[PDB]
Amino acid sequence: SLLTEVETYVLSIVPSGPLKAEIAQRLEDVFAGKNTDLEVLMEWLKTRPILSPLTKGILGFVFTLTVPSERGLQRRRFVQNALNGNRDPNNMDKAVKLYSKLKSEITFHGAKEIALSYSAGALASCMGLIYNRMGAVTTEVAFGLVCATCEQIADSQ
Amino acid sequence: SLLTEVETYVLSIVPSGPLKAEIAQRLEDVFAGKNTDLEVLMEWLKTRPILSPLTKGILGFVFTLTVPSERGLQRRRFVQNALNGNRDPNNMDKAVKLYSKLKSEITFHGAKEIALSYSAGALASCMGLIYNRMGAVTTEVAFGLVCATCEQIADSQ
């Protein structure tokens, strides 16, 4: 299941312990269409301890895509910094290169496979590019990108 | 003064009429620091008739850059959508290339010079990288980048 897969890849990069079962629960409620309202979750996430800025950025990216509507909720600075690729032009170049390819994909698996050739930083930057409205993709591709990003991050630990 | 320079360049891409006189006054007010709030200014811009999304975006970039502080105001969706080079991979590729060079640039004239070598689309995309926190440049250089963008847009007109 698309969302089942997303949850597994996302949690893989989340520290073990209490907070993790919290993210699992919130992720599942949002996926089930339950716990509505994007800015409440985002603010909760922004202020959570233990989580690294990147994993918050990755989660922030997920909630933003999965909630029915974000309304006029502006994109969060905290997420924007986390997915900034460290302002490294090299990551950016790769990000755009990767974006150019994902642009024609519409399936989760097709998107996941092409993005796995890139570094975790290149992928986070691509995510950033999409989160910042400068790049656009389908929900399934965005999710593939997230999973590849998580896989890459996880396999480096 | 670099600022009055930015004003003229920015004003060059605004159509004539009473609205242009107001933009001029608000810019001059910001420069003199007539204690103007960013949220207030951005909402004003956002809702102006006549001005196109691009002009609105360019002006929004100048205001956030010259206000004393954003006061924690999240970046605006209307600007992000205006400065995304139309989400085109090529303008984006060129933008990253220009950013890569502006990064090491330190003067207004130098940034402007190199900037004028790129297309208007790659310049708006570049302004987007800055506005989205994906890249970072010294103010004077950013000032160079906007004037270049305006010069290229004014020329094609």
Numbering used by the authors:
A (entry chain B), B (entry chain A): 2 to 158
Quote the study on this structure.
As the most abundant viral protein encoded by the M gene segment, matrix protein 1 (M1) forms a shell underneath a host cell-derived lipid biolayer to connect the vRNPs with the viral envelope in mature virions. The full-length M1 protein includes 252 amino acids consisting of a highly organized N-terminal domain and a flexible but less ordered C-terminal domain that are linked by a protease-sensitive loop. So far, only the N-terminal domain of M1 has been structurally resolved at an atomic level, showing that at neutral pH the physiological monomers have a high tendency to oligomerize via a so-called ‘face-to-back’ arrangement, whereas at acidic pH the N-terminal domain exists as a dimeric structure in a so-called ‘face-to-face’ arrangement.
M(NLS-88R)-acidic has monomers A and B or C and D associated to form two independent physiological dimers (dimers 1 and 2, respectively) in the crystal. Least-squares superpositions of the four M(NLS-88R)-acidic monomers or superposition of its two independent dimers resulted in low r.m.s.d.s of 0.2–0.4 Å or 0.4 Å, suggesting similar quaternary conformation or monomer–monomer arrangements. Interactions between the monomers that form the face-to-face dimer in M(NLS-88R)-acidic, M(NLS-88E)-acidic or M(NLS-88E)-neutral involve hydrophobic contacts (mainly between the symmetry-related helices H6, and between helices H9 and loops L9), as well as several hydrogen-bond and/or salt-bridge interactions. When compared to the M(NLS-88E)-neutral dimer interface, the positively charged Lys104 side-chain in M(NLS-88R)-acidic has reoriented to avoid close contact with the positively charged opposing Arg88. In addition to these conserved inter-subunit hydrogen-bonds, the G88R mutation also results in an extra hydrogen-bond from Arg88-NE to Arg134-O in M(NLS-88)-acidic structure. This additional inter-subunit interaction may explain why it took longer for M(NLS-88R) M1 to disintegrate in vitro at pH 5.5 than wt-M1, as the fulcrum of M(NLS-88R)-acidic was relatively difficult to break during the dimer interface rotation. Of note, the face-to-face dimeric interaction is stronger than the face-to-back monomeric interaction as indicated by the BLI data. Thus, the acid-facilitated M1 conformational change is likely irreversible, presumably to prevent dissociated M1 from re-associating with vRNP in the cytosol after virus uncoating.
